[model samples]
Target chain A: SATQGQVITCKAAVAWEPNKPLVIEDVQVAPPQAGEVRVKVLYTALCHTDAYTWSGKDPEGLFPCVLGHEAAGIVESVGEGVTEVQPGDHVIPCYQAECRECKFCKSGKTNLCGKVRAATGVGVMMNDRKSRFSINGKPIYHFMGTSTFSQYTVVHDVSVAKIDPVAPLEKVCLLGCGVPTGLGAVWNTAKVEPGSIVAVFGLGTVGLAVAEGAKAAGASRIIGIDIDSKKFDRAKNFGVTEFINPKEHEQPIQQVIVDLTDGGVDYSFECIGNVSVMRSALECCHKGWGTSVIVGVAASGQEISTRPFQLVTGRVWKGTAFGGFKSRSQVPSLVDKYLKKEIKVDEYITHNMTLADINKAFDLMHDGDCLRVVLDMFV
Target chain B: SATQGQVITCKAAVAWEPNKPLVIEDVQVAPPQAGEVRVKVLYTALCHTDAYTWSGKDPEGLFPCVLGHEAAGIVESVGEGVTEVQPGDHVIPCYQAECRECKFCKSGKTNLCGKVRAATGVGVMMNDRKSRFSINGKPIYHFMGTSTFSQYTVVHDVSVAKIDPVAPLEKVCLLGCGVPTGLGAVWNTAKVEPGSIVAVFGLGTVGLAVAEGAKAAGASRIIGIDIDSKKFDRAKNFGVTEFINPKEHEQPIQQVIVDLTDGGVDYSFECIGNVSVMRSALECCHKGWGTSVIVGVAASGQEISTRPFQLVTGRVWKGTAFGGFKSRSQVPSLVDKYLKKEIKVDEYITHNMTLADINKAFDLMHDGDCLRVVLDMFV
Candidate 1:
């Protein structure tokens, strides 16, 4: 049973198999299920991970999966049990759902909601473990929590966080994942105290977000390192105090970080999943006490190895998925932060696209020229 | 001239050469200089590092080294400006000296004071950069601090933490390093929350002290893992609810720990420096969020490696030295904890030997049957 909303049919880009181009087809409209809400996805961000998930690397690449996790849209309909969101409400689909009652959520130490964590892998129902939208008699699995590739999709009430509707959904859609996960890590997980030293590896959209977040967090120095030399320009205006090209450096990149921080960074983040680059991020940390967090998603079954003694000698090695932030709690605060203008979410969406242009959108993101590409499904 | 009461003759066991037994002889002791104090070494506990230094594995091992970091004694003399201690007070000499102004000490984080940290590998004078102790004019490099194998030694004012003289010298000597390092690791470093799960590797004196610390910290479940089957009996009384003998297990130890914790431990400590054991310790940590602190001194140049995704997923890896508690500021309280019977320091001392018998003491510790061997300088 669907909720009370104007029913509409729309086309969605789907990846029925890995390494294949997206397929566009008509999708049937459903109001909303119990505790569910439907949104007309005005914009969605295309990230490197989105493309990675489409390349058969995502072992859980559920066939006929509607791909897209970073999303912002206007609410069209609400299920019977919906209480918070209403029509015309602007919101971001939180990839990680939060159950406020979980130990992590209640402890105020994390932003991930335990309520929606279980649905991350299964292609079937998101929570009840079943797919919601079907087209041409073929059921489509929703990827992560939100499928912004579609014109409209059903999500858990807990998955979507409402923000001020006046803000442009096209621009803020990048905030859904990359911006917050990057910047949230700096603000929430790392708690980079003012005047603290911070270094971010990977100058992608996520890395840029981390740099800006460090600035917003009052970090005394924000150094961004990448193999690409051209990203230095993008990173500079993004509040990056310095940039390092690992490919150009003969010695390890951490050596430069060590030089910059006068020993090592107080906090380091690996936005790129390259294991060696990850090591560079950690090794650059202050000897004996530097803390490095991993944000990049690497291939499955692959292991990270370093001299265990490093962790033993005062350095900390840890990681956070989605910036180690609790989605529900962090999403709300992020929205408020945006409203307060503490974090710059507008300038990051370097490009935008239609549902039919998602493949090209991914190419833009891959070229690193674009920080974010949001899909305006209705357009 | 060493200061008044600072100048004295004392019997000491000094390592004159690597791979050779420490020689027991009388050496002239100087009075405390600026920021230094003199103590009559009463009791000293043998540690594995002392054994490793004896084995010539310490590439930096400088001889004529006086080997004893875990020591308890009475303050026999004070230099002209000494204030932390005076004649007749009891104190424990820390292996890692603390200058509380350093960043680590100020952060109130884990121990390993950066000030004088470099001096640890070199036993030269603190300020003058030369050995303070000598035998027949042959300069004897002070091993660690205190050189407790001697009847009397000069130490930095910040190196000795005052304790009640009524505490048993031989029994409380373990608190100087092994006991406090392990116990404080659980209470101070990892901060194992109440009713949280814990796994400790190696049932040495320090490992047992960690067990006692966890017990005091209100940990509901403590798991002890070791290769020595005989240790299981001793570990049980320390409040270890579960024990595993690696020799008896056929399955991988990591899997066993993950299974036992019903996922993994909320907190874990690696008391042994073995890389494989460190791997097990980190792997056994709870999926997504467990933290493992390494306290063991691994061999120089050895490394511990794991998948970066381990951190990417959730686990945190860190290391601590000198118990992660400042010797000057926290050791006094640790001694109080001992005097009050909140921790079992006295029972962990299984052997007492004369300064001339340190060679045998080292052998006993290596045999693993004895938890600790106290060099009873009084004998």
Candidate 2:
């Protein structure tokens, strides 16, 4: 509470440039502005999006930025006019904001809140269009809206969800992005029904989450597809009844799936973000009422293509963002579900490290050696 | 009733070869086999599919075939085991069959019955896999299942729907294909909600039918897009509140539409078979719950492509066949709707001609001089 309304010096992993190791150094975090909340980031997890932005290939990537979105934290200070969250409140910073007054949030049809989207994209604060994190009087840009790669971060009030105090910050932190994305894509986007068949195109945490959702929805079959056969063994715990290694089959993966499932799966999800796999996920759906939801973020300018005949014959193609969860309105309930053991969050954590070792976590991700690696902001 | 067990000689507009005028000649109509019905095709309408086949562009088009699918008729006879329609019952023959026993029909999710699909594709009867029409012992193939170009056509019992006796064959004939395909895509496929904004690409009969269905569903804004500016004037009769002629705009039509409708239309229908326009239809949908339905048949081997971001941001792409209608069970109800003055069927007909002028009807369609040309088979 002593740090309220004052600049706090803290350690952070900063990506000074693309395709290089992040530097863990001391940075100055400014106090929250009006309608903002300053958070003491307790635990942060590395996601593919963080790696994507670090690679400099992301068109939205900016230099000298703190890159982390999936994290759990405690509100350290509330700016003027900020009422939704206060100091000491347990919360998770959301990349997908939910300003209930915005048209997108009010529509009840999507979670892509329009409030702070433009400023968030440019890596600046909504109030002053400036960075809250700085080094030696130089501004360090923010990644997404959370920027939890730092020990302290500032986000718009709409981009933070206060969760149950009993929930573990390290585990439920996954709910900030990956877990909810996969689960909500299945529950809200595809609305997987009982007795349906589902195929997930990747066996990472998100794909496994999809399988978990499918199992909870009472799906008759859950098929997991991945290039790495090792993921199949660990995926069994998450309800993947069938495993497919595309390299094991001679025919196209879609055709193989069609042959294995009588016709095709009732529902499919593309979790790898490969354009080619997106086509396979779509093509591997049943003729009548089969739906494929795109859950992965493909590279910029990448296109997905298929014969219009596929859709014209009764298959549907769609995509989801933030798992179709309205961050502020729906995320707290997801945390409650996690608290009740209705969903798995701890199982996704395969490694743990401190902020100083964050670069190794990226290696673990690049080498496919871990599902998720959570970093403690303070050792 | 006397013609039930015997072959009857009748006039037919036969496509002896591709890209040639259909020759009106005397052909022997074979008696209905088991699970078949012989119908006296009283009135038929020329659709783009028939013209596509006549132009030799359709890969499914078989030469020396009777090319017609949209029509109204009276059941002249029924083969053994045919009990759905009796002699003298007014009916519409559906190109999309509805064998209630097939998996597709039983699923209640699609109208694409698999019962006679194999034989139907090859222009043959389901029972014997042979043509029902012949000229001097040479077999003339059927087109789409209902080859109504013949004065008397034999169709699988599952492909014919018995309608109200008082329903005029000339007007209700359009309900056989184009009307239902457009109307059902709106009512069943996209399920356009009340007060939703709709954009229909192409202002032909099917496009107008889409507009009609949108109006009946309480669409607040019906935007009609076509290259032919002339269609704009006639579209107002079918609930087209706004019109856009692509030739009049310098920007891509989809951008213009997005600007006109604040963000974009809630729903869009691609009624033109052009793949380029299909992309426009999909892109012109509003973010976060906009849906685009593909109602037109694209050229063989053609594909639809778009940046995967479009879908990932909350747009859905889907398509319908036969308007997503279970032909046998639903066509009769559509006819009832027409009788109740709830939907338009007669407004689609723009010209009337005898069987001898069938080739001219094709020309009129190609020249964009007509919406639909009804052919009197017996004249």
Candidate 3:
């Protein structure tokens, strides 16, 4: 609690500009403002979204910013009007906020809180429209409201979920993004039924999580598809019943999946952010009652398209962000699920390093050999 | 029963070629083959599918064919092995069949029966792969397996729905296609919940039917979008509480809608077959839980495209055929609903004409003033 109402000088991995390696720098972390909470980020994990913004491919990507969204931490301090979390509370920062009072939250249909979206999109604080981190008096922009790459970060109260202290920050940190997205896409979005056949296009952590979710949901078969066949070996542990490598087939993967599944899969998931793969995922679903969910974030301006016939014939196309989990309200339960050993959290971590070596995490992701790389902020 | 086991000569409107007015000719109707049913089409309505095929725009549209799918009639006869319906039963020929035995039908997720689809797409009877109608001994192709433009036509028993004998053929004929498609899209496909806000694009019969369906589902607001203001005057009868003519707006229709409805509507429907409108329909939905359904048939080879971000943010894109109704099981209840005055049926009929003036019905549809033009096959 000594950090409360005081500027905390700490090391943060900062992106001075896009397409450049993040530089670890001693930064000035401002105390939380009204309705904001400052957190001491203990463990942060790299995600595709982090790389997407880091690569400058994100149209709205801002430079001179501290970038990270998936991480778990301890609440260092709470500003006036912030009642959700107190100092010493374990928490995870959510890019998708859940202000129960917002129309979207109250509507009971979506978890996308409108409270901080505009400010968050512009890389600023919701209350004061200012940066909470700076270097030598120069302002550094925020990334996704929750700049978890920093040892200490500030976020709107709505963007922080209080978690059980029993859950380890390094392990539960994975729940901040990918794991829940995959599992939630299956359970909440597609609602994969018992005995359903599922096809997951991309055997990354997210895709594997889908397989796990499908398997838990009583799916009779879970087909794992990836261009990289190497992933197939490790994917079995997560419940993939079969493997498909597009490189081995002359026909379109969608057709192959349809033939393999005897017409088509009951459910298909696209965990790769490629639009073409998205189409294949949709096209591979059975004609009537098959559903394809988009779990990947495609490049900016890229669109997914198929003959209207695909949808007209009974296939449904949907997409999920943060796995459709309403952050503050649901993230705690996801942590509890991990504690209960009902879902995988630690299985996703393939590499661990200090925050100073964060760039290696991005390299491992591009190499496609790693599922997740956890960066210990204090290490 | 007199038509059983015998070829019946009937006056039919035959499309000899694309874009040509149908010629009223004396055609010989073959008796029902095994698993087929011959119906004396008493009242048939002109639908966009008939017009679409007749316009030669349908890639698979076969020439020298009798065209019509929305029709109500009495079963003139049934071939051997036809047990679902008997001779003299009231029936509606479904364009989307429900075999109740095929993979799709048994799946209980879709109404698209695959039993006759392969043959139906080629404009032929299912059992023998031959035309059931002829002019001057030259075989004329079928259209949609239910060529109701003829006084008598044949369809696989799976494509015929036995209805209550007390229902008027003229009023219930709309149930064969447009009316049910709209209603079912709302009830079955989108499952528009009570108190939801809905936006409907296009004000044609299908659009109005969607409006009517949305109203019955207890929608709080039904927004009707069209380029033509004339539709606005009549749309209110079907429960459209608001109107937007895209031609009058400088902004994109989707933005206009999103602005008008605070964030966006809970559900949006693309009733126009234009691919561009489909994009608008998807984009106009509220972030998080908004669902957009494609009820219109786009031109052949035309694909529906939208930024994947739209779906990733929580909007859903779906399409329905025959309003997602299983023909054999669900169409009768729709007719019953019409009989009970729970839905609009007779109100959709704008013109009544003899089969000889069938071409004029097409003209009326193109003129944009008609909702439905009912053709009396025997008149």
Candidate 4:
């Protein structure tokens, strides 16, 4: 176990610029500053969001930075006032943290902690607005407050959730982002009821996890919708009972779903970040009481619109990030849920690779065949 | 009381053409057919919806019709299959009915009933595609299935709510529409919690009722926003703790609200039928758990749009009609609350007029001084 204040250097995949392959290089990672922790990333998963930021599509993406959020790690060191986790603790890094102090965190109605949000968005440490990772004496920005691309990364203590030690880091890493985000949205954000019908748009890791969650919630019919019919079979294993290829239908997907399920679904999730799909997901919700949750992150400057008549007639439209889970407090319980076999985290890991082959992970994501590619940082 | 199968001629203010003054003429009103009730509409309140249709702004508005919905009446007679209500019972005519058997009514999660909705929208009875009112043997269209503009109107038995006989019909008539709509939205739709902050846009009867509802819900701060500063004092009596005139601020009304409240309001309501105001109402919600309910009926073809990030971050956008009340079942209790002095219904009626001077009520509304004009249909 290391002391609270000690600087370390480790290898990291650095995104020097947008739309460029990450450069695997040695980077100097500073010690845990106040309210921060240093994480030794054991395994990380390449989510579509990582590629989205890397592909320059994310407006908030800061290049010349360490860009990764979905990962399981060991706490190498803890900074002052950090009682949540200690060195050698197995943990998952959360992009959205739970300070449990801010109005949002205290409200109990939402998990969006407002305390460290301002600094996290700009790729800096909340303590002093300073970079924690530097490549060859040059400062590199952090991604989502968790620079998990590095073998050694620094994150705010509040953003790290200590998990069960027996759980394999490689598998639990999938829960760091996509798994919990999908699962929690159904349970927490939408609160999908038993015997209800669910429609999930896009059959990626997030979408599949939502189906898994809907099944666990006792949803009667779990419908998986995607342009790629190939994804349906795999998604079925995760809990989807019905499959829909949008291309096979002559009518609009919303109308098709409405026809299939009497009058739309009890709950619909938009897992693909297409604004049109988001609208469709909303319109496909059952007229009186169905709620459509926007789990997919839309492009910057994009807006979603529907006739206010939709809402007036009783359908609710809302969205969630990080699946409405408060990282420090709620995520550990999620890990426990995964350990008890209530959640399917391992099913999302479709591929595995080393840090050296990280570029292949993005290619797999682009191919849309891979659910999640777990990367061994030290392999 | 008239026998169940009798037809009668009654005075009605019929719309001869779009945007033209109502023609007060005697029309043949058929008695209650099967599953129907003939209501002796004693008093009716003119809501903004009546003006919207009468002014030709509502695209679905059909001419040569009787227009009025918010009213108090007595069941003059009932049809063979009507067991829910009987002749001589004091009742309120609901535009939206609770069949209690339809999927929507059975859901228990929503107030919108699927039965009678189709025929009601097109101004005809569901039993057969026929109007109950006819002038000189020529059929006159029905409005919102109630058409309280007619002294005696026929409606589905499912659309009538039997209220406490002791409650003054004139005072409790406000509960037929705006009062219950505003109050129920706060109590049911938004479910405004105690000690929460609230913002209500527009200062019409509906907006004041929202403030009153907020007050009844124990809201700590009730902020009322409107362009008309004159409506402030009356709104304060309802519960408005603060007031904002958008014209006074150079910044957007949303920004002004955000500045007034530390972050934003816990709940907000758009009671004005303006799309831009709806957008402002949604944007002004608190970052994490704020919920904005759209109570205003906007113009046809107008859509409300907002950056998806707003919903993605935790603010909820929803809407309500008739305050999310199952009219047949819920409106009666609201009248009871009014009778018990638990709810303010009398305060909403700013003016009263007879059927002969009903056109003057529209003029007062157009002049923006009228909160609600309760018209004596018998006159």
Candidate 5:
């Protein structure tokens, strides 16, 4: 824990290509660079996106990418000129770096890190030029920039979000991504009004968060739609006022939600990247008041379709990332909201695993056995 | 000429089946009803959607439809309680009615009229839900409520957008659809900001109108894009400061646009409804600050595609109908803008022909001979 001559090394998962599984190994840990820091990743969650890139499915990964962008970690080292953290500080690795000086980040309307490319991306590029991770005699692309899959990862000071240490670390991992995305779709992106009707398509981890967010945002009607009946009960725990197994509906869930809302729900969150489901989420929102927020990452090579008239008819179509909140700036606030019991991250976070059990985590997802599974790198 | 009660059996083009070319034949024209008026057809502008329905490509069209939405004519008579127009008034027929009472129309954000669906649809299906156009008692299903490819047509007073008689009738016909669609996308739908970078995709009539509208709105960069080189000259004359022929640039146009704007343009219009082009338009917008307004109609059953990341990264994917403006209430303002030289409408009008040349206009569009072709029925 000393500031000098102390470095940490840990095992992690890295992807070499899209058509193969992740490779687990011990990688050399680099000390934080100027204006950067190093963190010991305590818990890392397997987001659909993490799985998406491991398959080499992402065209931009450039091969051998280090995966995992969402996690809760303890800052173990800080580079020269860094003041954000010290040893034992609990924090989440913000995948995106918000340069507060940039036009977008300063505008307070968007979350894109304006100047992330050059400061990182040793071969890993964020915006200025791709380069983030380096292993012994090889290059490991930083998945986002955090690379939290690794037990000890190097990151920029701006990329770290200090969180309340008391909150369960597993819960914080979920907050790092799925929850913020879902909750942000309701609270930040769509801004669901009180007494509004909200429909969330695909009740996965993200979709459930949207339900809870809508309920928390004071929406009068929070309807959850999913093809599986087994997941319907999970949605109810998050304050979903009503739920439907899409399979039980007479027509497609899109039309069903439209009818149930007397037109369409006021807001919709596309929680599953299935193109068909995205359309259902968009079309289910009430024609005029409905604002569809796309939060799910569709399978690679797939696209989202909507009639131009849908958005043009007073309905809006948009998307969210990091819950449409600046991960670094907003993560702490989300944690604080959880501490206040405003959002129940503790109830939804039901699965935890060790690094050795990571494959089972993915299998659980494929079988729909788990909403979220976090890898305790330390364990 | 003054509220005369006369029924004229005249040549009318009617759609009898899907993919069937409407033929011209004699049909009786009915007198006006309460809050209704009759128009002596002067000119009608053809649109891609017209061909879509008549060719059985548009699923939304009523079969055996009498299709024509972009039209201008002189009012022949007004029924009881019709105060919007009088005999001899020159007007354009708005396809979508504006109830004025509905929140959409009342708020000036939409042209869809909730009260006018029955009025527009019943032109073919009367109160009894039977076809009104009959050739020797064989009824033809009315197409898009207007039935403009005829010597005369009937519509509710609310559908008539009266223009100054001094304006060239042929030029006014262009405003009935494409001009309003494109201009509305910029002015009312996306509401282009001064000095904002603007791009209009498709480079047809609507695209050029959007360019002109962008210029009117004080846009600093009015970029026009099209697959066809023929659209370039017209786009420039209508306030386009730059042009990109997608055909000329072999790679993806989106990348080129993103490079040109040093990230992306601020506001873009998908005027052609080509799903790929629409996607490119959204992606080509200014990173984290771009808003793409879809103004075109894709093929029936055809959908749009894009990664949710594109939107979450700072671009907004949206659509516009009738330019997201009240064509009736806004038509007058459009005309005033024309009078003030705020927009250039004539530059987009590439052709003027007689009513007998209706099919030729569609052919020209298919061949890219013109951005727009107006049939001068009065000639």
Candidate 6:
């Protein structure tokens, strides 16, 4: 592979079809085009999102593509007119982008910037609506605009966040998705106030991050709910004061949680992506001022239902994506926070492996043995 | 009927059974007890809530009761330690009370004072947990604590708001329920910001009041939606900038509103108690920072459902009761606003009749031909 801004061949795990294992092979990575950046992924973390797309459950999932979104990498190159980041800078890939010029970006009210959203959603370069990766001769589509499964990935400039070089890439890769998604959900999305009671459903990387975030927010009580008691130990370290095994309770978990907390938790985060659990999360919130933030991504074509009385009685039902963090702007500070040891990204990395052993990452995560599995690209 | 603070006989319209016209009969009125007050019901307005319980759809609907809550009257007498309002004071009944003692009342977060909630929901006096009305000495149940269908009704002192004496009881009576329910939903519940877009589902009294509230909040555009096009003219007078008839649209009302507003509405209100419309109201909000407040009281056992994607993309689903207004404190201020012409109440009163013709009020309301029908006790 030669530099000079030409096509460079890099190893990537390609998802040729759904519900099948990815194929690791040499793929041609094109140079960054206008308003784009090329990232040399040093490390990537496998998330449920990748599994969701790979499982074929995602309605918009496109094949002959690379799948990965949570990763920390070095900016290998920048395209024309890209000024925020430069080559050699440590950065994290962001699925949620922030184009400062868009109305959504300037609104200062939301993280969803629509400037590159349409193209990014379709797994293409925003500049020319084309993929930057090719295998043999066929073009391979991107994933989440940051296919960290590939050693080299092209992403819109708006979807890249420069981070502190001090933070270990292998560890900070978790912050690229689940960690921030949970932490930001509590901090920015729910704004969990001091003395508030918090409930977190699911004990995955995101739920653990929510516990950590709630602890930082000064939550009086942090209740972690998961069917699996295995994650309780790890959840406790992240500020979960109590744990609920739904199977252990005779009644619904929502009833148990509500009964245990007198009324219910002031704030709740649903990270399981199951619609029924999402309903439970909302129902387990306090009567007058409880707010449930759905951080989970449900299956395609699925919907959530509940009696309107739940809301009418003063409970709020809402959700957060990427923990409500603005990619190009807020995510860098999140990395800095992680570097300062404010966010515990290291605790979530349960397994480490080379890109060749990436299939094992999915297995470990599937067996619930790994909170997160990190893949080192150069190994 | 006499004013000597003794049990007296008064003309009343009593609901003897569900889905049946109220029976006009002379009922015995009991004197005020501890923490209660007796009011000479001068004028009252019929609301959908009255119809809801009358139609036998309300799960808590207790028949063989006087069914009315939105009313204005003169305080006939006060129970021991009841010093909030004196005899002869103008007042409006509040189904949602404000004891200013319970956690919800003192929290300044909600109007749901649970102190009288249990008794109120069951249609009884909080102090004694018993009805004060009877027919031929046979026990008769109360409705919503007010039972404004009777010439004399008793309420917990904490559940009444003393209004301006100058304000006409006939019009300000509307403030007791639907008017405040709609206007307060906008001003207090949604806290709709200035220059934002608002969409109100259903063009009944509450929807019209929501438009009036949006206008008061300086909302840039107030979009009124209703199946009936006849409401367009009346809705326009209340600051409705545009109108949407769901029957006229080829696509869903949500898509129509989203397309019309360039994205979606900033604040939406579901003013009809239809569960399906609640879903539509929620789906019609903008993806980032859009909020839908449910003011309509859905039928018992009815559920509202939508794709979790709706909320996950940044829209909020919540609801309000009594417009999130603290009955005793806030309702009086609302009456002041009405007196000052800052709030519109009279426009909602489309029909007037005597207590003997109160059934006609329900008939007109059920027919969708009347916004509100005020019944005069002495007419």
Each candidate's interface RMSD, rounded to one decimal? 2.4, 0.7, 0.8, 0.8, 2.4, 0.7
Better of 5 and 6 by lDDT: 6
**Model 4, which residues run further than 4 Å from truth?**
A1-5, B1-4
Which ranges of candidate 2 are over 4 A from the true structure?
Answer: none
lDDT score, candidate 5:
0.75
lDDT of 6 by residue, B99-125 (tens): 888878878778878887788788788
Please report how far candidate 1 places residue A98 from its true position, in Å. Answer: 1.8
**What lDDT score goes with residue A166 in model 1?**
73
**CAPRI-style quality class for the chain A–B interface of candidate 5:** acceptable
lDDT (Cα, 0-100) at B260 in candidate 3: 95
Query: Residues A1-379, candidate 2, lDDT per residue (tens digit)?
Result: 7898899999999999999999998999999999999999999999999999999899989998999999998999999999888899999999999989976887878888888988989999989999999999999999898898999999999999999988899888899988999998899999998999999999998998998989999999999999899899999999999898999888999999999998899999999999999999999999978899999999998889999999999999999998999988889999888888888999999998988889889999998758999998877
Least accurate 10 contiguous residues by lDDT in model 6 chain A: A1-10
How high is each candidate's TM-score? 0.91, 0.99, 0.97, 0.98, 0.84, 0.98
Top lDDT prediction, candidate number: 2
lDDT of 4 by residue, A1-379 (tens): 4435766877999999999898999988888789998989999988878888999988888889888899998888888899988888999988888887877877789988867778889999999898988877789999988888899888887788889899989898877788888998899999998999999999988998899899999999999999998887788799999988989988999999999999899999999988889989999998878899999998899999888999998889899988998887877787788788877777788788999988988888888887888889987
Model 6: interface root-mean-square deviation in Å: 0.7
Tell me the deviation in Å of residue A308 in model 5: 5.7
When sorted by lDDT, best at the front, the candidate numbers are 2, 3, 4, 6, 1, 5
- Give the C-alpha miss distance for residue B47 in model 4, angstroms: 1.0
Off by over 4 Å in 1: A1-9, A28-35, A77-83, A86-89, A102-106, A114-119, A126-130, A133-136, B1-10, B16-21, B26-36, B76-83, B246-249
How do the residues A1-379 of candidate 3 rate in per-residue lDDT, one tens digit apiece?
Answer: 6767899999999999899888999999999989999999999999888888998888899889999999999998999998778898999999988889967888767777789989988888988898988999989999988888999999999999999999999989888889999999999888988999999999998999898999999999999999998899999999999999999999999999989898899999999999999999999998878899999888887889899989998889998888889899899999888899888888888899889888888898878788889989887
Q: Better model by lDDT, 1 or 6?
A: 6
Please give the C-alpha DockQ score of model 5: 0.38
- Model 5 lDDT per residue over A51-92, tens place: 766656666565776678778988888877877678788999
Q: Judged by DockQ cut-offs, is candidate 2 incorrect, acceptable, medium or high?
A: high
